[PDB]
Design a protein around this ligand. Structure first.
Ligand code: A1AAB
Ligand code: A1AAB
Lengths: 4, 361, 367, 4
């Protein structure tokens, strides 16, 4: 899960 | 039954941020959506990694393509923020820290879309809606006119983060992961986006951290599937869409005294490939002397397969990205190192391919 | 899906002191109350609340909300939108006014989520233009991701919400459409979507009023969803009406006093002469001296039909509409007057009597 | 129409  | 004068869309996928964390999924999201909108008879133009000047220029040219009755969709994948109910898109060249002045305001874009009497205004913002502490400014945008045709599909809620998947090479972001399964349906865009929100509420990885948010004012049953009103061969359907047609011009397959191929990945991302068309033991085909504007590295050039250059989907492949930065004609050398005999000769032929895709603009 | 309970708070403001007065929130709140009751909702419906009264009702509504509860708030009346925040203006707002005089919808949403609700709905039937006098910038916390908030706005941001120019018992634009859709067994988001389409065919408000829907709702929830398997006790206390009584008079006149619940803070009283001695050739059943805190104009009291008091009630009785029951400090005491005459006597005779009904409907929540 |  990588935040933008 | 309801009809579109024309159906135009703009997609911007920023990943390579100069002073901010880097994303990897906006590449596939923009590639996958471009294909789905093209299936829906949409005229599209997708652009990866744009700076403030480039983003503003691509938004300013998207407004020229719009007119009364046209369906205007804008997709955005990358860093963003929401300050006092206003959403902003962060370009790759934006500094750290940054303010409204450095980012494009989603709301202003809609105001300019309204002046062109659009029949449908869609904005799918696949970005984080978290606040900016540095941004102290608060402009009063003169209240939007009541057109009853605006649909907003935000990948996440106000003060929340929009996520992408790390696990795979062609891994999609949460929004596009569900949107791709529902986009081709013949429902009203608000109904279509409602089905996406339900599928999203069935993923355990997104629970409590990412919910879809839909702001809408659409009164008519309009859909992306909606047919175009006129033929694409009129002294209106050609004049209005003249500029879009020019930003799709891939160079002609060049013949070498070796074969040069030209493929389009994105409206600003090209991919070239050299091909091996009895007295020669071995020969090498190489590509060099690329303009310093595109900023390519030899380690990433002349790769064996397309996946070795950072692209989607026997030759030597070169990913010519950021074509928007190109200042006047793409000229490059095709090196040929051959062996007859212990001698080995090197030949250099300067190949000019003109201004391809977005560079034509 | 199912709901643990289905509760709704409805506010309609019209009696503005320094701002233009409205007429339709009466009909709008009245109609939406009946439709929600058909949908198993426990409704509290209040008219013309001042800032203190709005804050008390909002706060107690939030306390009733809980894990799995379907909470619905309806506001018809004056309002404004500044920097994405919606504010409900109470009848006692000054001119000019700021965010401290109003109630923040965004702030209420935060509290609704804390009680881990299953579905949250805000049908705000108000204008959303800028209040330029309010120069404050609001620093509020980021809402939690709950994927269960549905916002039914009657108009878009920077636009007004409309009702028909002071012409009788007609609804506002939002309600004119919402009432013929509300009982449908479709998702609350899809039901509001249909309401936008109907509204977009009205000619009166084209280019001036369009319905705005803002939703986060993932689950297929609807106002028709059933209830499975303290809240009911507190809610029943605010909906008690005084029982029918009989006023036997000295001259042998038997009067009948009936009571009806129009709104949670509006009660109708109706006087009927059930026994008239044969020597009383003329007699009138008056109802005088009401608490000053209620504010009852005698020009509006004792009408032949409920309609000429402002009522929506279903022989030979006089109606009196007692509004502002929430403004009661003491018990509801009033005089039932008798102006009678005899077959023979020349002058008319006066006969008073005092009636105590206590604290009816919302007046039982003594604040 | 009276606005509100
Ligand atoms: C009218 O142009 C057509 C092609 C078009 C556009 N124009 C567009 O993207 N133009 C553009 C122009 N210049 C630059 N530029 N490069 C360096 C400096 N400025 C760029 C840039 F963003 F960066 F790539 C873009 C936009 N949206 C749409 S939806 C459609 C059917 N057609 C279009
Ligand atoms: C638990 O209370 C129950 C009865 C209830 C309420 N409480 C409610 O309206 N309380 C309230 C308290 N005090 C005052 N007050 N009177 C003078 C000054 N302040 C008021 C006022 F608005 F004005 F009438 C209200 C609200 N909503 C709901 S939906 C439901 C199923 N039940 C309710």
């Amino acid at each position: 899960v990588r935040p933008r | 039954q309801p009809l579109a004068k024309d159906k135009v869309a703009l997609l911007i996928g920023n990943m390579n941020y100069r002073e901010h964390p880097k994303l990897k999924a906006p590449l596939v999201d923009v590639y996958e959506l471009t294909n789905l909108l093209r299936q829906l008879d949409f005229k599209v133009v997708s652009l990866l990694d744009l700076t403030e000047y480039e983003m503003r220029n691509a938004v300013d040219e998207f407004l020229l393509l719009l007119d009364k009755g046209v369906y205007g969709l804008l997709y955005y994948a990358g860093h963003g923020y929401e300050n006092f109910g206003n959403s902003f898109m962060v370009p790759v060249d934006a500094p750290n820290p940054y303010r409204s002045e450095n980012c494009l305001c989603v709301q202003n874009i809609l105001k300019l879309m309204q002046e062109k009497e659009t029949g449908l205004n869609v904005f799918l913002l696949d970005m984080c809606r978290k606040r900016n502490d540095y941004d102290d400014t608060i402009p009063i945008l003169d209240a939007l006119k009541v057109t009853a045709n605006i649909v907003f599909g935000y990948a996440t809620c106000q003060g929340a983060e929009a996520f992408e998947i790390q696990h795979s090479g062609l891994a999609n972001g949460i929004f596009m992961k569900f949107l791709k399964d529902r986009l081709l349906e013949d429902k009203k865009i608000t109904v279509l986006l409602d089905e996406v929100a339900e599928d999203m509420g069935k993923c355990h990885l997104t629970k409590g951290k990412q919910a879809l948010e839909i702001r809408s004012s659409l009164s008519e049953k309009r859909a992306l599937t909606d047919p175009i009103q006129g033929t694409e061969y009129s002294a209106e359907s050609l004049v209005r869409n003249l500029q879009w047609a020019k930003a799709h011009e891939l160079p002609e397959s060049m013949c070498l005294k070796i074969q040069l191929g030209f493929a389009a990945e994105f409206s600003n991302v090209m991919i070239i490939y050299t091909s091996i068309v009895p007295e020669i033991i071995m020969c090498d085909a190489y590509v060099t002397d690329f303009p310093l504007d595109l900023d390519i590295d030899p380690k990433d050039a002349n790769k064996g397969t397309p996946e070795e250059t950072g692209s989607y989907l026997h030759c030597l492949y070169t990913r010519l990205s950021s074509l928007q930065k190109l200042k006047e004609h793409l000229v490059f050398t095709v090196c040929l190192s051959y062996q007859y005999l212990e001698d080995t000769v090197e030949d250099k032929q300067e190949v000019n391919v003109g201004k391809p895709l977005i560079a034509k603009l």
